[PDB]
Amino acid sequence: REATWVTEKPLTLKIHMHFRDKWVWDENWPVAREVARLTNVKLVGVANRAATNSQEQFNLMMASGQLPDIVGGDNLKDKFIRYGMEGAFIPLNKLIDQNAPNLKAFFKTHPEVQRAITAPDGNIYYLPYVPDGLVSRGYFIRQDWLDKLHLKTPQTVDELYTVLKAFKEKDPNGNGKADEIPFINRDPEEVFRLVNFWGARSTGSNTWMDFYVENGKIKHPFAEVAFKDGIKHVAQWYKEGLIDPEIFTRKARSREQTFGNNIGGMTHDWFASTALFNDALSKNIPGFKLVPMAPPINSKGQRWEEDARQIPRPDGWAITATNKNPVETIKLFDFYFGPKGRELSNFGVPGLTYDIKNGKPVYKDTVLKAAQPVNNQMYDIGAQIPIGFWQDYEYERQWTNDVALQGIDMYIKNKYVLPQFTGVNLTVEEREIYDKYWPDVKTYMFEMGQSWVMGTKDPEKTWNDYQQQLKNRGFYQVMIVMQKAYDRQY
Ligand SMILES: [Ca+2]
């Protein structure tokens, strides 16, 4: 008997949750048992641990003809809505308004999150995983090279050009050869992001080549004339050797390869993992210092950080039509948005993974010092999982190094991160058009982008034929769909 109990009579419900192509809900998790006793609702997992693909598992369940009481997982937003509109998942609007104080309070302060999870009919069919902290990537530069060469931190695009050229020509690594590669990136798509330096967008969100909104109008970065002008500049820098000539092929281990071999001078990547190269290289390469840099003022007079975390994520859980206890269930869901529920779902269980010190959750030293990443230690006990929960950045701050936090706090403070596109939820008919043409158009745009950057094709001479292919491949039909959907949802 707890003050937090959502029912006096103990309840057991079946949950089908498969995620990250490897994990499932485990009723034996310390976090699951804690929530169970605090709410009086226990969840039993019915998902398959042998599965290689989470989406396939959801499909088999939906097709089986039978349904559990709750369904959760990653990348299920579109399925929650499609099946929600067919009655498989119940709408949560009224249940929340009447039984979930924590959620309605949350939604009042986060109206954009509610808008992002709303289906074409106005119903909420699931609760999302809501990450905390918008800052994701940022620019990093070799401070030791700026120092060796007596250069000031570049404040504008042209000043940055001057710096990268010095890195290229003035032998900062001191081996007497011009082996330096000024800008490197493990993600080829980041070369497209450089058009930001000339006031052009490359994507509306963390998803590569995504649409963005400007004054209520949907636009795609790669179809804009501004992209044409901007990619010419990126192409010029590539021609001059300022960008890794292998930018489209090096990939995954680019940072290890280039910074490791002491030839990389700058990148744009996630603060935490990038800042850790200092730990690895501080001694190996005497004087090595890779540090966060504010984005330079672009050709339109603005400092842009186009990337940010997707908030909310297209992950979460929903209540099925077969669930005989919808009210008790929504109250369970609500528990996760209140203080205790939020603490547990973020940090684990007191005495096992953390302790409450002066009213605040602090990870145990063995947790912070373990070889296994904190994220994985949390998944192991039922925390940081893709159910409907409200992430707390404090948990991540506790395992992010100082160089990273110094840069993150600078980006937050100076407001460089641009407003993100949280996406639109489509109707079945709109989806059919999107799925038929978009995949191929996206592929084509990338191939064209690469050709222009590498100087294989000329943006000026091929722009019209490019736009013709866009029309022919259905780009504008997709654009019609997106705008209708945007107007309806926002
Ligand atoms: Ca050199």
Tell me the structure's resolution in angstroms, rounded to a single decimal: 1.9
Residue 184 CA to chain centroid, in angstroms? 21
Q: Give the distance (Å) from ligand 1 centre to CA of residue 257.
A: 15
* Span from the CA of 458 to the centroid of ligand 1 (angstroms): 32
The DSSP letter of residue 156 is B
**The token pair that represents 336 in the structure block:** 């996760």
For residue 274, what are its two tokens?
């990038």
Measured CA to CA, the distance from residue 343 to residue 31 in angstroms comes to 10
For the record, the structure tokens of 283 come out as 């001694």
Contact 152/294 with Cβ under 8 angstroms? Answer: no
Query: Backbone dihedral region of 262: left (phi > 0), alpha (psi from -120 to 50 degrees) or beta?
Result: left
Helix axes 77-84, 428-453, angle to 10 degrees: 160
Characterize 62-100 residue by residue with b for buried, 16 or more Cβ atoms within 10 angstroms of its Cβ, and e for exposed.
Answer: beeeebbbbbbbbebbebbbbbbbeebbbbbeebbeebb
Q: Taking each helix axis from N to C terminus, what angle separates 225-239 and 428-453, rounded to the nearest 10 degrees?
A: 30
CA of 264 to the centre of ligand 1 (A): 11
Structure tokens at 88: 């498989």
C-beta separation of 204 from 212 below 8 A: yes
Known binder of ligand: residue 244? no
Q: How far is the CA of 167 from the centre of ligand 1 (A)?
A: 9
Does 180 appear as a known binding residue? yes
Q: Pseudo-torsion of CA 171, 173, 179, 180, nearest 10°? A: -90
CA 417, CA 360: separation in Å to the nearest integer? 28
DSSP assignment, residue 152? P
Instruction: Find out whether 171 is annotated in a ligand binding site.
Output: yes
Ligand 1: centre distance to CA 164 (Å): 13
User: Tokens at residue 261, please?
Assistant: 């071999």
In whole angstroms, how far apart are CA 30 and each of 41, 360, 406? 14, 20, 34
**Structure-token match 């998942």, residue found:** 89
**Annotated binding residue at 432?**
no
What is the chain's length?
A: 490
User: CA 62 to CA 216: how far, in whole Å?
Assistant: 36
Distance in Å, CA 277 to ligand 1 centroid: 20
How far, in Å, are 12, 90, 156, 301, 313 from residue 25 at the CA level?
14, 21, 49, 49, 19
CA-based nearest residue to 488, from 153, 119, 159:
119
Give the Cα separation of 391 and 379 in Å (integer). 13
* 180 Cα: distance to centroid of ligand 1 (angstroms): 6
177 CA from centroid of ligand 1 (Å): 4
* Residue 173 assigned as binding residue: yes
Is 396 assigned a ligand-binding role in the annotation? no
Q: Residue 375: how many CA atoms within 13 Å on its side-chain side?
A: 7
- In which residue are the tokens 């119903």 written? 123
Contact in structure between 120 and 427 (CB atoms under 8 Å): yes
Domains, in order of start, for the chain: 1-132+311-399 (3.40.190.10), 133-310+400-490 (3.40.190.10)
Instruction: List phi, psi (to 5°) of 201.
Output: -90, 160
